[PDB]
Amino acid sequence: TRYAGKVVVVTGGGRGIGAGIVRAFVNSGARVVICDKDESGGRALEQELPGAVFILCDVTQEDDVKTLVSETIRRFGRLDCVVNNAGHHPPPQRPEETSAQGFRQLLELNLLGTYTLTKLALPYLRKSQGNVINISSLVGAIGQAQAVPYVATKGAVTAMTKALALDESPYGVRVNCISPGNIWTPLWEELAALMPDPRASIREGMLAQPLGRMGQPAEVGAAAVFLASEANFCTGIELLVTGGAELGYGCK
Amino acid sequence: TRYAGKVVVVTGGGRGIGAGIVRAFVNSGARVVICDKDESGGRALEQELPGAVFILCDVTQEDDVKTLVSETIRRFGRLDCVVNNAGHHPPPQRPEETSAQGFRQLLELNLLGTYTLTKLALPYLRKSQGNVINISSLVGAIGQAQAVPYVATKGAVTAMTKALALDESPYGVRVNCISPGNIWTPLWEELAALMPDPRASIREGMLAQPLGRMGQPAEVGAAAVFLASEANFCTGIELLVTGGAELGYGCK
Amino acid sequence: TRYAGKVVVVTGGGRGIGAGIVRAFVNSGARVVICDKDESGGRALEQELPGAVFILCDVTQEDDVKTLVSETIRRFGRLDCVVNNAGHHPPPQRPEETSAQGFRQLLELNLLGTYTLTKLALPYLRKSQGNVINISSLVGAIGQAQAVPYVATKGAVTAMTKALALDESPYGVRVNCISPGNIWTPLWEELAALMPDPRASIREGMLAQPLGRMGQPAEVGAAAVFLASEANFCTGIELLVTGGAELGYGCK
Amino acid sequence: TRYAGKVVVVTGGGRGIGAGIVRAFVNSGARVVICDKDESGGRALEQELPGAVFILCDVTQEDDVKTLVSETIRRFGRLDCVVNNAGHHPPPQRPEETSAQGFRQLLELNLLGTYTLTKLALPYLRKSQGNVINISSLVGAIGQAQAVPYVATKGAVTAMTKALALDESPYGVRVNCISPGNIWTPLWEELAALMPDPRASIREGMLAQPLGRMGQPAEVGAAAVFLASEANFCTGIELLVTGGAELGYGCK
Numbered sequence A, B, C, D: 001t002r003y004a005g006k007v008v009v010v011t012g013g014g015r016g017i018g019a020g021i022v023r024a025f026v027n028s029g030a031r032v033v034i035c036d037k038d039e040s041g042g043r044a045l046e047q048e049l050p051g052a053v054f055i056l057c058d059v060t061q062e063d064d065v066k067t068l069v070s071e072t073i074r075r076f077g078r079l080d081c082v083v084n085n086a087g088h089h090p091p092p093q094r095p096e097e098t099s100a101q102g103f104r105q106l107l108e109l110n111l112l113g114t115y116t117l118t119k120l121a122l123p124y125l126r127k128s129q130g131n132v133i134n135i136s137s138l139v140g141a142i143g144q145a146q147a148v149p150y151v152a153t154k155g156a157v158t159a160m161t162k163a164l165a166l167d168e169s170p171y172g173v174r175v176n177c178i179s180p181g182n183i184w185t186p187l188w189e190e191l192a193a194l195m196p197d198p199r200a201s202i203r204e205g206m207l208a209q210p211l212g213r214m215g216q217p218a219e220v221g222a223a224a225v226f227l228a229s230e231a232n233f234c235t236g237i238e239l240l241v242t243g244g245a246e247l248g249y250g251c252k
């Protein structure tokens, strides 16, 4: 009921955090368009959830995104919320091991893909007085070791969220972001598998939070539903979903 | 349904933001104890809302607060959430017009009252894996003119929220705060009435937000219900409910 | 030369960070009044440093502070900078082990002592277009375990710094703060000595910073001299002197 | 004397903030390499300042930057500090008026140019235990209207500064940034000239700060010299040089 009659697009919604956000919006009564560059997870999610449908779309391809928006409007008649979740964290890379071209590529996904869908969706969000939710990262705010390009892309997303919030406020379109800390997802598991001791890597990630565990996609999803449906006086905020990782002293 | 079977105490719940928080929790299915030093608003709210009851309590009086907690447990058998909302903003005061004793008095209400109820409630919150929500202010983070004591008390509340979150995390008790900006309440109206041109004061307060309006108690209430019921990986966060007042350049 | 002809008051200047700030200002060419409630360290510093003199003053005693200001003006004819450094970190205390009265006492030293000297000094700082520097703490911003009252007092100091900066900006008086992280001082050493394994406590404190060491009083002192003498467009800022402790993930 | 015997590279040092930073480091005793894509200002500065020399270099051209570093080492034998100041603020642009390609171009200058010089300089900074200073912007932290691409690039710079600080801390290389607010420069003047009422635009920019004026390049320069020469326990910090623009409520 909380978001009934509304239409939501979630990028990277085929697995991980994006899938948890898809589920949370379906559970709120919304119709959800799952956007993903990979077919496997998103196609299964459409079969599983009445009210969710899957559209293949690579957010780095401008024409893919144009088609995502026009098909969303053609099939559902309105657009109320865009969740820019698609993005990627590379394996650990020392600064001297990064490249300008790798940096540009990560910018294309983590930042410009968010920019392009938001831009194409804003005319419809203005009609609906809808809202934008960007999935950034805690490490955009506090930094991270061996991740100069990734951290830079999320710093940009969080800052862009505030600029856009200023620009769209006279039209009643809110723009917010969520900064998750360690969330247990296939990406986290993939990255842990590259480590010498994956179980040690995972235990270390759990202990980075005062709460002693990592977060869940469903917890990010509930934050997104709050921002969309109940946060009518929130715009340009950075909602931390981190288990307290930013608090207090730790072993650095 | 979202917070059914839960018991919530809201201090200063007789009017303004506190009353909006009371209403939001009742609408979520919780039973609510309205604490206030004034009888008029809170007594009427109890008559109006099934599931809410009023207990007279001045949060600066330690024995009042002891009785608030013990009566809450006696009457409802559990305690899941404490919302420390009671507090006051004095009229504008130049720094040379403040006094150490006025500062101590405002500290007693805005900070130590929050500290005392939280302390007395924590043994019951640990049993329920409940949570604490402190109502701070945006001006604790960014400052405000002619309000040195007030700003200082809210800086302390926001910082204390993070310290307590660290201490209580091994027990599964989350501690968060909400920082509202300009919310249209009887306090805001009272303060505007002291100005030479109250309508000019109010128009200026509306235009301090990119959204062009002040916030509502119900919007603070929805943020509080989110933190209590759906933010299980959030602890020690400062949730801004400000309409974007902190964003961008303005006339300073 | 950088602060020649200027007169600076440093509270708690008899040892630790305060003594490092005294030394830095003397080395810059300023005359320095060392305020401390203890005679031993401050008296020796006056004998050691030409241009520094010691005045016994407990910043929690309003009449002590009145005399500190009037004696500073009587002896040196002007007042350009007040460094509010006096303050104390109690031993670790679980929240249920704190008291309202202990909290009030720490507020008297860490917050109201800073407030009282600043208030009495502002008429002279206005004449000189001088400035105020408050020594807060990183843990006011990010929290700390087993330190609810301390963290709250430094949250208040940092917020008060911004409020005062707003109030005094039309008079050209800047108000800034420094937030040190772990600085190796007699206080740090005293607190480490209370731990079961003091050498383990100290090694843990060094490793809380990416730089792998604690900071020095002289490094806080150089930050203070910068704010006083060269930061003419800085007001209301929080200058972090923390070795990066706030950056990245750590063992929490 | 404060930075005697040291070698500093300042990008965009031919005018504006960069020229003020060049002057501040020369006045501190350092030798300075002025990098700029434009010959006019930087060539004159070399003639004016003994100890400063001009090297033509476009920071978006990787081979220009390779030559800048190798010529700095060839001519001066060491490299102690890199100030990444080159960058540009476009005219106001509504979000629907921006393009992905314009965004990529601004990223090339404001972000990747900083990344490329830092990367090529780090082997020499490690030898000297030198430091990096990035010139970001206050609007990366708080947002700005009609500047989505610009704000995003400075959000990235500030975040990248913290990531790099973490990576380089075990080598004793500090990485910090300065976030100026409104600084009176040829860029500010150029942008004001595009407005309908340039004098009204400028008066509005002065009043955006509680101090009632814009900042000077020399004030940014003094902050940079502090970070390089005296801030040995500061790494990953964001030093605000804004006149208090971020403080308090304003007309938004």
Ligand SMILES: NC(=O)c1ccc[n+]([C@@H]2O[C@H](COP(=O)([O-])OP(=O)(O)OC[C@H]3O[C@@H](n4cnc5c(N)ncnc54)[C@H](O)[C@@H]3O)[C@@H](O)[C@H]2O)c1
Residues within 6 Å of the ligand: A011, A012, A013, A014, A015, A016, A017, A018, A035, A036, A037, A038, A041, A057, A058, A059, A060, A085, A086, A087, A088, A089, A109, A113, A135, A136, A137, A138, A179, A180, A181, A182, A183, A184, A185, A186, A187, A188
């Ligand atoms: N996992 C964490 O701890 C964590 C923490 C903070 C932020 N984040 C952010 O959350 C988001 C999701 O992370 P995750 O852990 O769920 O990752 P994930 O790898 O598990 O899932 C990402 C999904 O996005 C899709 N995707 C990738 N590139 C795409 C593209 N070009 N177009 C469309 N879809 C694309 C993938 O196919 C996948 O289904 C990312 O923005 C990530 O940076 C994650």
Ligand SMILES: NC(=O)c1ccc[n+]([C@@H]2O[C@H](COP(=O)([O-])OP(=O)(O)OC[C@H]3O[C@@H](n4cnc5c(N)ncnc54)[C@H](O)[C@@H]3O)[C@@H](O)[C@H]2O)c1
Residues within 6 Å of the ligand: B011, B012, B013, B014, B015, B016, B017, B018, B035, B036, B037, B038, B041, B057, B058, B059, B060, B085, B086, B087, B088, B089, B109, B113, B135, B136, B137, B138, B179, B180, B181, B182, B183, B184, B185, B186, B187, B188
């Ligand atoms: N109104 C705003 O714009 C605004 C903005 C930011 C923060 N806040 C904070 O929100 C809270 C509520 O503000 P409001 O505008 O609703 O104020 P309000 O004056 O309208 O309501 C406050 C309520 O608290 C009660 N109260 C006061 N002192 C008390 C005490 N000692 N014990 C018990 N109850 C007591 C009052 O009787 C009243 O019912 C305060 O903490 C305030 O600082 C308000």
Ligand SMILES: NC(=O)c1ccc[n+]([C@@H]2O[C@H](COP(=O)([O-])OP(=O)(O)OC[C@H]3O[C@@H](n4cnc5c(N)ncnc54)[C@H](O)[C@@H]3O)[C@@H](O)[C@H]2O)c1
Residues within 6 Å of the ligand: C011, C012, C013, C014, C015, C016, C017, C018, C035, C036, C037, C038, C041, C057, C058, C059, C060, C085, C086, C087, C088, C089, C109, C113, C135, C136, C137, C138, C179, C180, C181, C182, C183, C184, C185, C186, C187, C188
């Ligand atoms: N040491 C750290 O790691 C650290 C970190 C962050 C902030 N701080 C802050 O720095 C300041 C100094 O800390 P420190 O480690 O140098 O402490 P310290 O105990 O070594 O020195 C404090 C000095 O202040 C004096 N003092 C105490 N109470 C006083 C009073 N009422 N009136 C006058 N003088 C008084 C003491 O006699 C002593 O000379 C404090 O405000 C502290 O909170 C310290």
Ligand SMILES: NC(=O)c1ccc[n+]([C@@H]2O[C@H](COP(=O)([O-])OP(=O)(O)OC[C@H]3O[C@@H](n4cnc5c(N)ncnc54)[C@H](O)[C@@H]3O)[C@@H](O)[C@H]2O)c1
Residues within 6 Å of the ligand: D011, D012, D013, D014, D015, D016, D017, D018, D035, D036, D037, D038, D041, D057, D058, D059, D060, D085, D086, D087, D088, D089, D109, D113, D135, D136, D137, D138, D179, D180, D181, D182, D183, D184, D185, D186, D187, D188
């Ligand atoms: N002026 C302000 O209010 C303000 C505020 C915050 C941040 N900043 C930042 O400060 C920096 C300098 O700003 P400014 O106002 O002095 O600008 P400016 O235009 O006056 O000076 C910039 C200088 O950089 C040079 N430059 C530009 N592109 C270059 C390139 N590709 N390679 C080499 N040199 C290049 C220009 O030729 C010029 O000499 C920028 O990073 C800007 O974003 C400025």
Ligand SMILES: Oc1c(F)c(F)c(F)c(F)c1F
Residues within 6 Å of the ligand: A088, A089, A136, A137, A138, A139, A144, A180, A181, A182, A187, A188, A191
């Ligand atoms: O933002 C991320 C992210 F995407 C990940 F996949 C991580 F493992 C992590 F630690 C982060 F901070």
Ligand SMILES: Oc1c(F)c(F)c(F)c(F)c1F
Residues within 6 Å of the ligand: B088, B089, B136, B137, B138, B139, B144, B180, B181, B182, B187, B188, B191
């Ligand atoms: O925190 C407050 C508050 F309580 C008020 F009543 C206000 F009017 C205001 F502007 C604030 F920022």
Ligand SMILES: Oc1c(F)c(F)c(F)c(F)c1F
Residues within 6 Å of the ligand: C088, C089, C136, C137, C138, C139, C144, C180, C181, C182, C187, C188, C191
């Ligand atoms: O602020 C402080 C302080 F004063 C101390 F003495 C400490 F040991 C510490 F860790 C802090 F964060």
Ligand SMILES: Oc1c(F)c(F)c(F)c(F)c1F
Residues within 6 Å of the ligand: D088, D089, D136, D137, D138, D139, D144, D180, D181, D182, D187, D188, D191
């Ligand atoms: O960062 C900048 C900048 F570069 C400019 F040129 C400006 F005019 C301004 F307002 C900013 F915030």
Ligand code: NA
Residues within 6 Å of the ligand: A045, A046, A047, A048, A049, A050, A051, A052, A053
């Ligand atoms: Na379906």
Ligand code: NA
Residues within 6 Å of the ligand: B045, B046, B047, B048, B049, B050, B051, B052, B053
């Ligand atoms: Na009732």
Ligand code: NA
Residues within 6 Å of the ligand: C045, C046, C047, C048, C049, C050, C051, C052, C053
């Ligand atoms: Na002396």
Ligand code: NA
Residues within 6 Å of the ligand: D045, D046, D047, D048, D049, D050, D051, D052, D053
């Ligand atoms: Na020269």
